[PDB]
Chains A and B, each alone.
Chain A
Amino acid sequence: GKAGDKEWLPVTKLGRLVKDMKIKSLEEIYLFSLPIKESEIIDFFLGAALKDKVLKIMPVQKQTQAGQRTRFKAFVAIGDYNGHVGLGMKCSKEVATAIRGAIILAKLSIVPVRRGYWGNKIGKPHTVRCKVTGRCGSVLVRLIPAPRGTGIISAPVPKKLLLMAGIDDCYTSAGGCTATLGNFAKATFDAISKTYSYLTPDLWKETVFTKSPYQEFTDHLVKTHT
């Protein structure tokens, strides 16, 4: 392809390390729990070859002095196929912007997924380590590990998110007003994200850990400006 790459320039030290080829995977950020504020960071480290699917469009409105207003809300999900996903909702004047912003929002939110084995761990993880549930304003989604070939047993919208996350097989049960899509996807998003939070016995032991690329790269991440 040839369209003339932009000229991203970074606000953030985390960003400088990334462009410099100093940070190479999101994992570094995730382990450090560095916050990510520049969307390009996500874009350079992953996202390249990460596909975004727009989930919904539904319009809303609120009342003006001289009567009405109405605008477009877009729900976007992003993820490779393996282990990374994000979710973003935006409402804007125009569909394109609503989608364009939503994608940006989704990327900022990208989250780790811990994918595991239903039980006999051969040939790499097909499902989830444990069972994790997430709730958003009365909708709650529960993910359950399942045997191979089970696949994603969820509603179409949820299947799509789980798919991008890179889950092969998982059982789901959903309670609450499933109809209100923004809520259902949000809860499932919380559910998947919760997998990293689960502490299993595998995790029980600790570690010099890390010094943080921010510290080692520190000079590197104070360029020659101010």
Chain B
Amino acid sequence: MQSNAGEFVDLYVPRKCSASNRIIGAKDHASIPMNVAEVDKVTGRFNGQSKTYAICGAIRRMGESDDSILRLAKSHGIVSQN
């Protein structure tokens, strides 16, 4: 949303679904993401450091949010042979 002199105008840049790459817009409160903990490898020891995904109202109402998370969590770990 540039303006004349490369300036950034209007007022915000919305987050985009983690499954459908579609704008979460802005009053659709039937939607939320999901912070997964990073682990200090080895195992346990929750260390931050979120691995995070945002899922749209749409996907969730269509009886996905879950799987989407899995394509999301495995593709970037953890989660394997799902």
Contacts and interface: CB of A to CB of B under 8 A. Distances in A.
Interface of A: 27, 30-31, 33-35, 83, 111-112, 114-116, 121-125, 193, 196-199, 202-203, 206-207, 209-211, 215
Chain A binding surface SS class? loop
A196 B25 contact: yes
A115 B15 contact: no
Contacts of A211: 50
B16 A206 contact: yes
Contacts of B28: 33
B26 to A, nearest CB: 4
Contacts of A30: 12, 14, 26-27
Contacts of B26: 30-31, 33, 111-112, 196
A203 B8 CA distance: 13
B24 interface: yes
Q: Which of under 10, 10 to 19, 20 to 34, or 35 or more describes the interface residues of B?
A: 20 to 34
A111 B27 contact: yes
Contacts of B14: 30-31, 196, 203
Most chain B CB inside 10 Å of its own CB: which residue of A111, A116, A197, A210: A197
A196 B27 CA distance: 10
Given A31-B12, A35-B29, A121-B3, 19 more contacts: A30-B12, A30-B27, A31-B14, A31-B15, A31-B26, A33-B26, A111-B26, A116-B10, A122-B4, A124-B3, A125-B10, A193-B27, A197-B25, A199-B23, A202-B2, A203-B14, A206-B21, A207-B13, A207-B16
A83 B1 CA distance: 15
Given A34-B29, A124-B3, A207-B15, A115 B10 contact: yes
Given A27-B11, A203-B13, A209-B54, A196 B4 contact: no
A211 B28 CA distance: 18
B62 interface: no
B71 interface: no
A121 B4 contact: yes
Contacts of A206: 16, 21
19 contacts: A27-B12, A30-B12, A31-B12, A31-B13, A33-B31, A83-B10, A112-B25, A114-B10, A125-B9, A125-B10, A193-B27, A196-B23, A197-B23, A202-B2, A203-B13, A203-B14, A203-B16, A207-B16, A210-B15
B22 interface: yes
A198 B22 CA distance: 9
Contacts of A198: 23
B16 A33 contact: no
Contacts of B13: 31, 203, 207
Contacts of A111: 26-27
